């Protein structure tokens, strides 16, 4: 049974609700982005209308096999009518294809559903500038003041400088970057660009990247591993055993691995500056964990919400415990008393 925070009142609409069978009353199923917790349930046997971005629709067709007749892609930043209701899709600054959805209800209420997002001041100059929002369905992944991490640009600067220095010292070093979903592609693309290399990967990951409308992608990636000195591997292989086993497969071309694990937040964030990050090392293998986030920090979240001034907030993440729900409600009331709405 579908929970309340995935339903849009006054409509036949649901958001990120594919794991509950046929939802009674649902005439259109929205999908915010192609991450497994959100698409859980979709397959080639789905027969209801799915609304999404172009990039998410390319992934639904090629990777899950959903038939074409049930995929409804919408352009971004454009007023669209769906089943008699005006909607807009906005860039969520999450992974490729990720959107927020503005719903203009027949009774005059306006609802923003963030999906998953990383709030940014540039959102204050989108179509959200133009009118009031009554209800906010909010990605609360990092809604606590301990969740701190740097800008994506600082993190990429660290990764590029780390890789360029290691390979310039040792032209026989290989760089490896872990992945388990779409998102975070700037990590491996920026490193391969500084090294003058294409990125090598499996056929399955190449297929996924070919769905993402990245300009000039054919110049950036390949399935020919031997030609490449930046390789992608599944995240589960990013450990000393997995990486040893990978170096054997390269036929004595390389004598050192430098590997990156993009994570979300980790408690090493509470003490260490990005500058000061050190790897885990065994022998000719070193592994860096780098805090590249595609969700809002506490501070970015609070600024967005204090600017938007919603009448009501419904969290979509951390909703399963009384303590998490209570904690989030306290911060929403602080923010409202501080800013005066
Ligand atoms: Ni996500």
Curated annotation (Swiss-Prot):
Induction: During mitosis. The mRNA encoding this protein contains an internal ribosome entry site (IRES) in its 5'-UTR. This 5'-UTR generally suppresses translation while specifically promoting expression during mitosis, when cap-dependent translation may be impaired. It is found in: Nucleus. Expressed in brain, heart, kidney, liver, pancreas, placenta and skeletal muscle. Binds constitutively to TP53BP1. Binds CDC27, which is itself a component of the anaphase promoting complex (APC). Binds PIAS1. Belongs to the DNA repair metallo-beta-lactamase (DRMBL) family. May be required for DNA interstrand cross-link repair. Also required for checkpoint mediated cell cycle arrest in early prophase in response to mitotic spindle poisons. Possesses beta-lactamase activity, catalyzing the hydrolysis of penicillin G and nitrocefin. Exhibits no activity towards other beta-lactam antibiotic classes including cephalosporins (cefotaxime) and carbapenems (imipenem). This is DNA cross-link repair 1A protein. It comes from Homo sapiens. The lineage of its organism: Eukaryota, Metazoa, Chordata, Craniata, Vertebrata.
């Amino acid at each position: 049974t579908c929970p309340f925070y995935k339903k849009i009142p006054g409509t036949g609409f649901t958001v990120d609700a594919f794991q509950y069978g046929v939802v009674e009353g649902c005439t259109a199923y929205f999908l915010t982005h192609f991450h497994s917790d959100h698409y859980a349930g979709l397959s080639k046997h789905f027969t209801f209308p799915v609304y999404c971005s172009e990039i998410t629709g390319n992934l639904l067709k090629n990777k899950l096999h959903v038939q074409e007749q049930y995929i409804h892609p919408l352009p971004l930043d454009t007023e669209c009518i769906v089943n008699g209701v005006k909607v807009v899709l906005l860039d969520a600054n999450h992974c490729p294809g990720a959107v927020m959805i503005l719903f203009y209800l027949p009774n005059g209420t306006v609802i923003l559903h963030t999906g998953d997002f990383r709030a940014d001041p540039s959102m204050e100059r989108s179509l959200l500038a133009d009118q009031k929002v009554h209800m906010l369905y909010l990605d609360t992944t990092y809604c606590s003041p301990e969740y701190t991490f740097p800008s994506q640009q600082e993190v990429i600067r660290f990764a590029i400088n780390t890789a360029f220095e290691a390979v310039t010292l040792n032209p026989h070093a290989l760089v490896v970057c872990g992945t388990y979903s779409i998102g975070k592609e700037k990590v491996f693309l920026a490193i391969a660009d500084v090294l003058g290399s294409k990125v090598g990967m499996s056929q399955e990951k190449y297929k996924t990247l070919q769905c993402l409308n990245i300009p000039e992608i054919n110049s950036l990636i390949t399935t020919d591993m031997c030609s490449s000195l930046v390789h992608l591997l599944p995240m589960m292989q990013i450990n000393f055993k997995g990486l040893q086993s990978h170096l054997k497969k390269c036929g004595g071309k390389y004598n050192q691995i430098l590997a990156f694990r993009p994570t979300g937040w980790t408690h090493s964030n509470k003490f260490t500056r990005i500058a000061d990050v050190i790897p885990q090392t065994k022998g000719n293998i070193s592994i860096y964990g780098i805090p590249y986030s595609e969700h809002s920090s506490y501070l970015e979240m609070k600024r967005f919400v204090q600017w938007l001034k919603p009448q009501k907030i419904i969290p979509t993440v951390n909703v399963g415990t009384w303590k998490s729900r209570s904690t989030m409600e306290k911060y929403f009331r602080e923010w409202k008393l501080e800013a005066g709405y």
